[PDB]
From a paper:
Forming functional ribosomal subunits is an extremely complex and energy demanding process, which occurs sequentially and requires the transient association of 200 ribosome biogenesis factors (RBFs). Endonucleolytic cleavages of pre-rRNA release so-called pre-40S particles, which are composed of almost all RPS and the 20S pre-rRNA, a precursor to the 18S rRNA bearing a 200-long nucleotide extension at its 3′ end. (1) Pre-40S particles just exported from the nucleus are called early cytoplasmic particles. They are composed of the 20S pre-rRNA, all RPS with the exception of Rps31, Rps10 and Rps26, and the RBFs Enp1, Ltv1, [name], Rio2, Dim1, Dim2/Pno1 and Nob1. Furthermore, most of the identified RBFs physically block the association of the translation machinery by occupying functional sites on the 40S subunit.
In order to better characterize the structural remodeling steps leading from early to intermediate cytoplasmic pre-40S particles, we have performed proteomics and cryo-EM studies of pre-40S particles purified from [name] using a tagged version of [name] as bait, in a wild-type phenotype context. A first round of image analysis allowed us to obtain a “consensus” 3D structure, with an overall resolution of 3.1 Å according to RELION’s gold standard Fourier Shell Correlation (FSC). Visual Inspection of the 3D volume as well as local resolution assays confirmed that the body of the particle was very well resolved, and thus presented little flexibility or variability. Interestingly, in this region of the EM density map, previously described ribose 2-O’ methylations were clearly visible for adenosines A100, A420, A436 and A796. In line with the initial consensus 3D structure, comparisons of these classes showed no variations in the body region, and a stable positioning of [name] and Rio2 on the 60S interface side of the particle. The first one hereafter called H1, representing 36% of the analyzed particles, was refined up to a resolution of 3.8 Å and appears very similar to previously published early cytoplasmic particles. Notably, the rRNA three-way junction formed by helixes h34, h35 and h38 at the base of the head is in an immature, “open” conformation. Amino acids 205–466 of Enp1, as well as and 351–405 of Ltv1 could clearly be positioned on the beak region. The resolved part of Ltv1 forms an elongated structure running throughout the full length of Enp1, extending towards the 60S-interface on the tip of the beak of the pre-40S particle.
Residue numbers in the entry:
A (entry chain c): 5 to 67
B (entry chain S): 2 to 136
C (entry chain T): 2 to 144
D (entry chain Q): 3 to 129
E (entry chain F): 20 to 225
F (entry chain Z): 42 to 104
G (entry chain U): 22 to 62, 85 to 110
RNA sequence: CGCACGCGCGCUACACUGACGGAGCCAGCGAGUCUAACCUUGGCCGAGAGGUCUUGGUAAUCUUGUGAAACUCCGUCGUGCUGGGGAUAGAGCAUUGUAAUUAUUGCUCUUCAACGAGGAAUUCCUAGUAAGCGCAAGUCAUCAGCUUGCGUUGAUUACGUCCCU
């Protein structure tokens, strides 16, 4: 799979049961035309780097 | 160290002093594999023979032991340790028994044969410890 | 340079001078520091059993060139070891003093260390001038 | 600029004073020679400013090391402080200051284990 | 190195670690290089230090602990079990007493095979424990990329101390193998055996 | 069987990648206390380079 | 021969502490230098030597009878 | 304080960062006889223990620089219910207590046990907190294991809310 790097320029906080899950808005890292909302569990912030697997999966539920 | 091998000489298990004083443990702790001999008996031999604990030990010669037979064979003149042994200057006999596998347990339990035939503690209840705790 | 006695390491002074005492043969072999162990914090007596005593009786060649005490009940405090008491942690060690009549009364045999009156042992010019011959059989062979 | 100062650092309750004056260039750190320093690996636990500012600036100092306390990780991690405290015997009274800007840029946030009191405080267990 | 001649004895090797820059007795840090996308940034040797134990208030803010030092995050591959940390202070010795063997196998400085080795275990996918209501299934989701990292680094924390705890050979010298071919999936080892199982466990029932 | 180790070291130190006591275990002869004895006389041959010394941890390096 | 104070109690020091430095002049028996003791919990323990007649330090003592 | 069972407490051992023969020899919350038997600093008595044949002390001095411990370096052993453990117990030694019995712990040396980080559940955790390691004390006539401290050296992981409660 392509290592679809998602720059984490904005972030929606820290929620969940234990306080770990996170909603994450991403404008893309390599090009700057993908606009993908995702969910990532764990410590992330504004202006960081993450990975997403598939091509252009704008999936909004990943807990 | 020395890159030299030999022709069938070294074993791995011996049969020494009527039991298994082995050819992978030394004088010292294969006389602990058989019950009755501790460390500093053959480690005071180190100041006279320089044989300590650092080897795989199918190497012993039966003529170095003959200057240790100068330390062993008569238990009345030959440097028997006197703050060391299993049972030693006993109530049983009175001599410092640094004995062997066939001669520790026969020289161990004359304190347990005694006291409550004598009505106190160890002459029925240790026989009860042989009529019950032995079967 | 100003090569001197304090500017050498821990046992490149004691056990490096013991490379020449084996060609002389000088000190005292005790009888029963041997069957007993040397302390309470011990498991096994020393290996070499010929050097074995040179490594112990010349440990005062630089330790008391510098300072002024090795005692008998006094070396308890300096020599606390690892006393696994089973239920308790490691603790403090009380040491041996009988045939230091042949061990710590073998320290004055070389003439390096004599016995101090504060408590312990002290050094003289006999242990600072002759060490410029005998410890400078190491110090003037490290130069 | 030569301090005649016991620059003082407490080792968490103790007297870690470094006797400071001018010198010749003769490193004496705890008796044993630099040829035969007893840790061969933690030998390099003595030299931070002698890989940063150089052996050219401060070769005119007489290092003394006398502290009370220590073990594995403070005896031969923090006699390293001595060549940031007895190498810099160059900043009060006698011999010219001029080298001052580069000891207030590379010694400002470098390692607070040496240049200020190391903040590994004592241990109250949170009552 | 333009020597200043001393009456105080110093050998040839002591002053070598300054202009001939090798921040061990015989080992460098000169080539920090990275292939994949996971582990670039935190080789934090920029202050001229031999050991660089920077332990201050790098735990209070929410961003600054990512920038925590390499000895204070990444060279924690040595302390994990606690009978050797519980008689603690014997634990400074592993990497420098071991790594000259790894400095033989195609390594001039020992980071050169390790250019393409640490990073290339880049984590892309891991499940969450689904609630499920009964059936504890697994979902095709993504954690942050610190698992196949810790399948290769936290399994070197155990893999140096706690997988060498009670080992046939010693503690620090079973590390004659731990960073030779750790680049990509071999699957025949103590830590690489569950490397495919981040891209298939979240793929099998997804 | 007298000096087969003498020829299969001087022709096999540039065949074995390392020099240790585990080389000898491939023939399944000895595992035991003749090993920490043999670290101070082995390298009088002169093909593999020693590096470091410590009395509790006597470690050298393959070449 | 010595004097040893006994001290179990930080707020009522400056009545005799100034009688040691700012008003010990009024009988011309000078003092030797006081070492600043490490004050363990408080013990302010002074020490004065007596080479003097029966009056003056016992004048500081026997007028100080308010038990 | 004797033991068919069961629990918890801490301390260990199940190993080669292990401890051992000796050199490298640091702290403090420090505590020590009045109308006396305390802290202890001289060699040795002693296999060992200290008596304090002596001495120093109304005290950061004399112990004391509590020359503390885990400890760092020349030599010891490459996995063998093992040079791991002293588990249980014996024989050769005390400081005492008017006598060591159900031995009260200080003292030389052998007996070397279960147990291959161990099924369920979890104990505390953020700039000084895990983590060891000491010191001396009510325990002391026999020490601290509980304890209150101080001192020595001081790791993975982090600002979050109810999923447990």
């Amino acid at each position: 799979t392509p290592v679809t790097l998602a720059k984490v320029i904005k972030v929606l906080g820290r929620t969940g049961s234990r306080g770990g899950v996170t909603q994450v808005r991403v404008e893309f890292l390599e090009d700057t035309s993908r606009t993908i909302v995702r969910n990532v569990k764990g410590p992330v912030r504004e202006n960081d780097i993450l990975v997403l697997m598939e091509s252009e999966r704008e999936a909004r539920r990943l807990r | 160290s020395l890159v030299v091998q030999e022709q069938g000489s070294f074993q791995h298990i011996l049969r020494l002093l009527n039991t298994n004083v082995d050819g992978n443990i030394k004088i010292v702790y294969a006389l602990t594999t058989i019950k009755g001999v501790g460390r500093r008996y053959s480690n005071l031999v180190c100041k006279k023979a320089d044989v300590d604990l650092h080897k795989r030990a199918g190497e012993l010669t039966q003529e170095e032991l003959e200057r240790i037979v100068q330390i062993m064979q008569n238990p009345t003149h030959y440097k028997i340790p006197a703050w060391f042994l299993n049972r030693q200057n006993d109530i049983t006999d009175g001599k410092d028994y640094h004995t062997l596998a066939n001669n520790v347990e026969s020289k161990l339990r004359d304190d347990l044969e005694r006291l409550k035939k004598i009505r106190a503690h160890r002459g029925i209840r240790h026989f009860w410890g042989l009529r019950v705790r032995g079967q | 340079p100003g090569v001197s006695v304090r500017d050498v390491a821990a046992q490149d002074f004691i056990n490096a001078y013991a490379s020449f005492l084996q060609r002389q043969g000088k000190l005292e072999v005790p009888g029963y520091v041997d069957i007993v162990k040397t302390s309470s914090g011990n498991e096994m007596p020393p290996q070499d059993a010929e050097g074995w005593f040179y490594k112990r009786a010349a440990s005062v060649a630089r330790h008391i060139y510098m300072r002024k005490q090795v005692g008998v009940g006094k070396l308890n405090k300096l020599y606390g070891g690892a006393k696994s008491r089973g239920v308790r942690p490691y603790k403090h060690i009380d040491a041996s003093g009988s045939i230091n009549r042949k061990v710590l009364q073998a320290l004055e045999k070389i003439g390096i260390v004599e016995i101090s009156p504060k408590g312990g042992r002290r050094i003289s010019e006999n242990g600072q001038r002759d060490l410029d011959r005998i410890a400078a059989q190491t110090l003037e062979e490290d130069e | 600029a030569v301090p005649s100062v016991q620059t003082f650092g407490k080792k968490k309750s103790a007297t870690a004073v470094a006797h400071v004056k001018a010198g010749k260039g003769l490193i004496k750190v705890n008796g044993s020679p630099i040829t035969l320093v007893e840790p061969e690996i933690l030998r390099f636990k003595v030299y931070e400013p002698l890989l940063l500012v150089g052996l050219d600036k401060f070769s005119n100092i007489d290092i003394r090391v006398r502290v009370t306390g220590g073990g594995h990780v403070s005896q031969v991690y923090a006699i390293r402080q001595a060549i940031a405290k007895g190498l810099v015997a160059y900043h009060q009274k006698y011999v010219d200051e001029q080298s001052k800007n580069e000891l207030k840029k590379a010694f400002t946030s470098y390692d607070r284990t040496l240049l200020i009191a190391d903040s590994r405080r004592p241990e109250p267990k949170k009552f | 190195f333009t020597p200043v001649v001393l009456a105080t004895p110093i050998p040839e090797e002591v002053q070598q670690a300054q202009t001939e820059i090798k921040l061990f007795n015989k080992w460098s840090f000169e080539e920090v290089e990275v292939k994949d996308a996971s582990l670039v940034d935190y080789v934090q040797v920029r202050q001229p230090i031999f050991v660089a134990h920077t332990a201050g208030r790098y735990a209070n803010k929410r961003f600054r602990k990512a920038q925590c030092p390499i000895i204070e995050r990444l060279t924690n591959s040595l302390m994990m079990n606690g009978r050797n940390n519980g008689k603690k202070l014997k634990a400074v010795r592993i990497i420098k007493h071991t790594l000259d063997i790894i400095n033989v196998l195609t390594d001039q400085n020992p980071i050169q095979v390790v250019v393409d080795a640490i990073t290339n275990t880049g984590p892309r996918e891991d499940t969450t424990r689904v609630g499920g209501g009964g059936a504890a299934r697994r979902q095709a989701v993504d954690v942050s990329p610190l698992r196949r990292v810790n399948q290769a680094i936290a399994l070197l924390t155990i893999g140096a101390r706690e997988a060498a705890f009670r080992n046939i050979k010693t503690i620090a010298e079973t590390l004659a193998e731990e960073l030779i071919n750790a680049a990509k999936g071999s699957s025949t080892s103590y830590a690489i055996k569950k490397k495919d199982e981040l891209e298939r466990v979240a793929k099998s029932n997804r | 069987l007298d000096q087969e180790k003498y020829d299969r070291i001087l022709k096999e130190v540039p065949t074995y990648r390392y020099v240790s006591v585990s080389v000898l275990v491939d023939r399944l002869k000895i595992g035991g206390s003749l090993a920490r004895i043999a670290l101070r006389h082995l390298e009088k041959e002169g093909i593999i380079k020693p590096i470091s010394k410590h009395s509790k941890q006597a470690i050298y390096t393959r070449a | 021969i010595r004097i040893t104070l006994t001290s179990t109690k930080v707020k009522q020091l400056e009545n005799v502490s100034s009688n040691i430095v700012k008003n010990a002049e009024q009988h011309n028996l000078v003092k030797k230098g006081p070492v600043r003791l490490p004050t363990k919990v408080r013990i302010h323990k002074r020490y004065i030597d007596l080479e003097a007649p029966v009056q003056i330090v016992k004048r500081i003592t026997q007028i100080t009878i308010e038990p």
